[PDB]
């Protein structure tokens, strides 16, 4: 609803990093770090079974 001047006055007069300057940034950024932290380390846990040759249980 044309908040662009009001958002310019926040994004320019701010100290926080650019991905944190919006008021709603804590709603995006805090779940994403948890989802990212499991998404990058769960294949690394399956790397040793793939080296040993152990397939997962499907039946």
């Amino acid at each position: 609803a044309n908040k662009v001047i009001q958002l310019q006055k926040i994004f320019q007069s701010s100290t926080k990093p650019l991905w944190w300057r919006h008021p709603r940034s804590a709603l995006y950024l805090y779940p994403f770090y948890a989802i990212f932290a499991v998404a990058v380390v769960t294949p690394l846990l399956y790397i040793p079974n793939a080296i040993r040759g152990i397939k997962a249980k499907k039946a």
Partner: protein
Amino acid sequence: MVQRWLYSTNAKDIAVLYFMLAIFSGMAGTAMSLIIRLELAAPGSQYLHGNSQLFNVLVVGHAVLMIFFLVMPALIGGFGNYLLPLMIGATDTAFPRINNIAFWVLPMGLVCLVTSTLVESGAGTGWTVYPPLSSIQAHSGPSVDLAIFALHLTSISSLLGAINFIVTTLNMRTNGMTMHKLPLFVWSIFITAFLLLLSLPVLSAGITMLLLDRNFNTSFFEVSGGGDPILYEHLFWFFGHPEVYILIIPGFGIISHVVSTYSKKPVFGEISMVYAMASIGLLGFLVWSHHMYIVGLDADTRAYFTSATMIIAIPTGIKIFSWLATIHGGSIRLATPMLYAIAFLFLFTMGGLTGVALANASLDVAFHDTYYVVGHFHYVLSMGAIFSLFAGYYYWSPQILGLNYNEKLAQIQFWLIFIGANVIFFPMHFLGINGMPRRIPDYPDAFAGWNYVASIGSFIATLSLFLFIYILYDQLVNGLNNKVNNKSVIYNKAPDFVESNTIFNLNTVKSSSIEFLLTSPPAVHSFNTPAVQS
């Protein structure tokens, strides 16, 4: 410390991350070549207990690491991202987050290539991963998939960096620099980025086709189903010859800088060098089937391809004659980059002459998949591109690091690698002309005689690499003292014959590019106000 190096957005930091990864992966590929060459030293199983699959996996790792993880991120990734903004007067590259992801997708390609080695048996297929060997019948398991993903992440890096380079030198040149007044290294990175942009799509298409063939039951190159592996050979080598001209064109730029600054006279006919590089890049797309002379083409196909493969000897000959003309009549200052440049000018021409021996499809039936081809390309690779890479390091390292290297140790290192590389790669022509095939872990006993001397030369080459590691250590620790004592060359240009030692002191550097005028180690904000040129 995490924002400067993990969240990085300046090109001069991403360049040294590229350089650290490049020299790490070059240590990896040199270790792999030492294992290959140690197994090849004598007939019979020597060090790997039989197990020719492990030999083939090591050959794959050696080729992929040395091409896509040493020479490309060294030359393009380090030297282009560092020097092209500094030599066109740009404050940074255009699109810098792209420039950061084009580095950080390379350790991920490295870890997936290493676990490609560690899963079931590795992908022993050659670096040209040909089906049906690279299929799911002949290579069961996740090895080849992870190798294909390594190639995908490296192609993502070298495509994003190519877009970055093209735009940042078409758009961010400083305010006197027309396109005709560019340095030759900038033209090198420019033409290389176009070759990357035009060639990496077809490779990505071909190896995604292979990946879908392996895992998604589709049949692009499956014969029982309607495929053809010659389609893979076409789609691969349409990238594969532009790839090897990509590997050599920044080397041409580095040599044209080094030769001119150590001959103390400008390059003979600079715009013809630009035209020659552009002609090599254009004609490199028209020659791709000289790697396919045996597969069963027509005679007129092979006649055109000998003609087109032959007529690229003209611009490379123009470049090499221009290098001889720009050292003729000079005042040669025999420093380590000059030694590497003269060794380039000899050994690259020997590799190119064996290349025009290979260009004749009439004759390539005697040399295909022999060690003669291995001799040609290891000449023009490990004595063209590696020698120009060493020349670029010894040419730019004290400027962009702030620390000088030991000059005597550098010349010892040069003479050891120049001896050792010749001793590896010169008998390979004898083996290949007598009929020794490629990619074999074991050979008939009549090939033992030159194989032994080649693997003796391998130890000279890796000894000079270990000496280079010590040269890096001595530069990083004692590099401020090498300026004080007489262990290093401080000025790469001597005074002219009537120039006083005091009149030299007001004009210590006499360069035709901005790189040697900057502050040593250059500022985080170079070019606050823009540089200006008539």
